[PDB]
């Protein structure tokens, strides 16, 4: 029944976060897809109240996957939003700045 949010596993963590009006949650597993596979994701913005957050994550394969879209997503902006994303460093905040 209730079962806690799986996050990627052993050498693959992805963290999608500041995605632009058009990405959003039922397209995230659209435009990642052949680059290799999803397992789990939901956004966490807290709709109500608009506080800066925007902040996502995402489960892949292998570690060969994690190096190989980590750096063709990084800086390329969508829009007026940019997209920013790395392997997972030590989580100490969920606020961009």
């Known amino acids: ?17 500041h995605l632009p009006q058009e990405f959003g949650d039922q397209d995230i597993l659209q435009m990642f897809m052949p680059f290799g596979n999803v397992i789990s994701a939901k956004v966490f913005i807290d709709k109500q109240t608009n506080l800066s957050k925007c902040f996502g994550f995402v489960s892949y ?4 996957s994690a190096q190989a879209a980590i750096q063709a997503m990084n ?10 994303v790395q392997l997972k460093r030590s989580k100490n905040d969920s606020k961009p700045y």
């Not at 800086?75 to 940019?82: A, D, E, H, T």
Request: charged share 25%.
């Open 1 to 17: 029944g209730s079962h806690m949010q799986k996050e990627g596993p052993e050498g693959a963590n992805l963290f999608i976060y």
């Open 75 to 84: 800086g390329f902006q969508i829009g007026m939003k940019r997209l920013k």
């Open 61 to 64: 394969d292998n570690p060969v």
